[PDB]
Amino acid sequence: QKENERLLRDWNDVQGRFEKCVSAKEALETDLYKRFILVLNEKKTKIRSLHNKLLNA
Amino acid sequence: MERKISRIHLVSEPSITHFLQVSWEKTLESGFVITLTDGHSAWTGTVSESEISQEADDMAMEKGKYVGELRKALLSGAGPADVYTFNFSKESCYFFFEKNLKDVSFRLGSFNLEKVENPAEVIRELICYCLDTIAENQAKNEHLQKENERLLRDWNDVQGRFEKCVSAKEALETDLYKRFILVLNEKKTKIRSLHNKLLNA
Amino acid sequence: YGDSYFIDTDLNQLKEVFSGIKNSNEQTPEEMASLIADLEYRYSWDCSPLSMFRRHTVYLDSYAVINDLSTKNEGTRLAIKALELRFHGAKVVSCLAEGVSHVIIGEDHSRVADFKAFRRTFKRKFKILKDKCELQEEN
């Protein structure tokens, strides 16, 4: 029973730190993808404007 | 009520010992059933009350100590700090236990036992109780072992996956870093090319 | 942002532009999950070792009864399976669904009965199982 409880708490704390690391990865990937998306939208708008002006030429 | 597997080996005879089948009243100072058996005769018994104050002038204990005294006299062996005589007066069907302290001996309470024969049935009941409690304790043993090893393997797996994830968050961080870098580099190359194209009249 | 339109990027300037951009994690995990999936498809970024437990199309049994999102029993790693189902890029799904393509026996292997019983309601069969190796067959 004592071994049961200690292994239960060990599994629980490692699963909790697993939660923390997985959530940290989720947030980091979210930030990276979102910021890159914004930069890429700026790039694509710039490219579109360049196409527009080249067409006007 | 409750039977307890406790054999206070009687100094007067080894074939009989007070097994515990205590039916305790509001306090162990009050009466309760103790059954000691032989295989050729059996005896229940009850404790007379008031047997507490007899030591109160003798060693000057405090109240309620008789409850613990009775409980540890019923349980296997004598009291850890209280001397007891473990015997049986088959002639009178009576049990007694001692109490000595502070440089003088004295006589604690006693069991006014009552003779009830047919030790066979009560011995059968006691041994059945023994076997059943052994079985339930073994069941608890195996269940605890199963849950313990289950949490062990759970712990190992979560450790492995947690290490995987802690490496992998930074791995994907750097991967996405370089991926975005190269993608935006290509976007800038497109922008440079389109600027050069627009430069023409 | 410091991100040029002509001169290419590196790790340092990308990190600085990103940090200068506001911290962006507020939407539902599935919308941004689909966004990550689409960007991986368009940019060949599915090659990440993390690409099979957090965003799209995997099924599991995290409940004693599927279609019953409320039952939970200790004695297995259902919690750990849910904690993993949000990491690599396959969607958290443990409900009777039709359009789901991946069905995977969970660490609660006693629900192979449940897995197969609701597999009849499913249009996709169970594979011999093997990030991608705890008890899995997405190949």
Curated annotation (Swiss-Prot), chain A:
Interaction with LIG4: annotated span: 36-57
Consequence of changing R48A: Abolished DNA-binding
Coiled-coil residue spans: 1-21, 40-57
Location within or outside the cell: Nucleus; Chromosome
Post-translational modification: Phosphorylations by PRKDC at the C-terminus of XRCC4 and NHEJ1/XLF are highly redundant and regulate ability of the XRCC4-NHEJ1/XLF subcomplex to bridge DNA. Phosphorylation by PRKDC does not prevent interaction with NHEJ1/XLF but disrupts ability to bridge DNA and promotes detachment from DNA. Monoubiquitinated.
Tissue expression: Widely expressed.
Modified residues (Phosphoserine): S49
Annotated disorder: Short stature, microcephaly, and endocrine dysfunction: A disease characterized by short stature and microcephaly apparent at birth, progressive postnatal growth failure, and endocrine dysfunction. In affected adults endocrine features include hypergonadotropic hypogonadism, multinodular goiter, and diabetes mellitus. Variable features observed in some patients are progressive ataxia, and lymphopenia or borderline leukopenia.
Family: Belongs to the XRCC4-XLF family. XRCC4 subfamily.
Protein's UniProt name: DNA repair protein XRCC4
Species this protein is from: Homo sapiens
Taxonomic lineage from the root: Eukaryota, Metazoa, Chordata, Craniata, Vertebrata
Gene this chain is encoded by: XRCC4
Swiss-Prot record, chain C:
Name of the protein: DNA ligase 4
Protein family: Belongs to the ATP-dependent DNA ligase family.
Tissue: Testis, thymus, prostate and heart.
Functional summary from the UniProt entry: DNA ligase involved in DNA non-homologous end joining (NHEJ); required for double-strand break (DSB) repair and V(D)J recombination. Catalyzes the NHEJ ligation step of the broken DNA during DSB repair by resealing the DNA breaks after the gap filling is completed. Joins single-strand breaks in a double-stranded polydeoxynucleotide in an ATP-dependent reaction. LIG4 is mechanistically flexible: it can ligate nicks as well as compatible DNA overhangs alone, while in the presence of XRCC4, it can ligate ends with 2-nucleotides (nt) microhomology and 1-nt gaps.
Subunit structure: Interacts with XRCC4; the LIG4-XRCC4 subcomplex has a 1:2 stoichiometry and XRCC4 is required for LIG4 stability. Component of the core long-range non-homologous end joining (NHEJ) complex (also named DNA-PK complex) composed of PRKDC, LIG4, XRCC4, XRCC6/Ku70, XRCC5/Ku86 and NHEJ1/XLF. Additional component of the NHEJ complex includes PAXX. Following autophosphorylation, PRKDC dissociates from DNA, leading to formation of the short-range NHEJ complex, composed of LIG4, XRCC4, XRCC6/Ku70, XRCC5/Ku86 and NHEJ1/XLF. Interacts with DCLRE1C; the interaction is direct. Interacts with APLF.
Pathology linked to this chain's protein: LIG4 syndrome: Characterized by immunodeficiency and developmental and growth delay. Patients display unusual facial features, microcephaly, growth and/or developmental delay, pancytopenia, and various skin abnormalities. Severe combined immunodeficiency autosomal recessive T-cell-negative/B-cell-negative/NK-cell-positive with sensitivity to ionizing radiation: A form of severe combined immunodeficiency, a genetically and clinically heterogeneous group of rare congenital disorders characterized by impairment of both humoral and cell-mediated immunity, leukopenia, and low or absent antibody levels. Patients present in infancy with recurrent, persistent infections by opportunistic organisms.
Cellular localization per UniProt: Nucleus
Ranges of residues in domain BRCT: 48-139
